Amino acid sequence: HMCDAFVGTWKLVSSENFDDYMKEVGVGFATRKVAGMAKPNMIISVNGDVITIKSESTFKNTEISFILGQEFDEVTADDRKVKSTITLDGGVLVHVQKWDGKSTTIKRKREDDKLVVECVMKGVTSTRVYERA
Ligand SMILES: C=CC[C@]1(C(C)C)C(=O)NC(=O)N(Cc2ccc(OC)cc2)C1=O
């Protein structure tokens, strides 16, 4: 019953400062424009110890499967090759991505009927709000 309140199919309903987050990450102009238009669905499931997070959009479809605390390699939607570790910290999924001596952290938390995604690169935060599909 690890992550029960996260499981399901979620749709993006609002975003703030995502262009600036992507700039801070190093995403180029054309990818920022197309990625910024997307309205992804996030599909989260659990089977034993394995959590799967899929994102489906008109930009890119991605999927990661992982065990909490256990590093894995990830190719991100913007085509970075990163090493990722996801943990549960006080009920928040905390996803750290490392590449090229850089780091970004993505936090996913349940707040009311929303799943709130906070993405941080250095001093820049973007907040993306999802609702059940
Ligand atoms: C539904 C997924 C969740 C999440 C979130 C940002 C981590 C999101 O809400 N929206 C997305 O587009 N992506 C994809 C993404 C990630 C990084 C990019 O450039 C740095 C560009 C596009 C995601 O991975």
From Swiss-Prot:
The modification Phosphotyrosine is found at Y21. The modification Phosphoserine is found at S14. The modification N-acetylcysteine is found at C3. GO terms for biological process: brown fat cell differentiation; cellular response to lithium ion; cellular response to tumor necrosis factor; cholesterol homeostasis; fatty acid transport; long-chain fatty acid transport; negative regulation of DNA-templated transcription; positive regulation of cold-induced thermogenesis. InterPro entries: Calycin, Fatty_acid-bd, ILBP, Lipocln_cytosolic_FA-bd_dom. Its main location: cytoplasm. SUPFAM superfamilies: Lipocalins. PROSITE patterns: FABP. A motif (Nuclear localization signal) lies at residues 23-33. Changing E24D: In a breast cancer sample; somatic mutation. One of its GO terms (molecular function) is fatty acid binding. Keywords: Acetylation, Cytoplasm, Lipid-binding, Nucleus, Phosphoprotein, Transport. It is found in: Cytoplasm; Nucleus. GO terms for cellular component: cytoplasm; cytosol; extracellular exosome; lipid droplet; nucleus. A fatty acid binds at R128, V129, Y130. It comes from the Eukaryota. Forms a beta-barrel structure that accommodates hydrophobic ligands in its interior. Monomer. Homodimer. Interacts with PPARG. Lipid transport protein in adipocytes. Binds both long chain fatty acids and retinoic acid. Delivers long-chain fatty acids and retinoic acid to their cognate receptors in the nucleus. Belongs to the calycin superfamily. Fatty-acid binding protein (FABP) family. This is Fatty acid-binding protein, adipocyte. It comes from Homo sapiens (Human). The gene is FABP4.
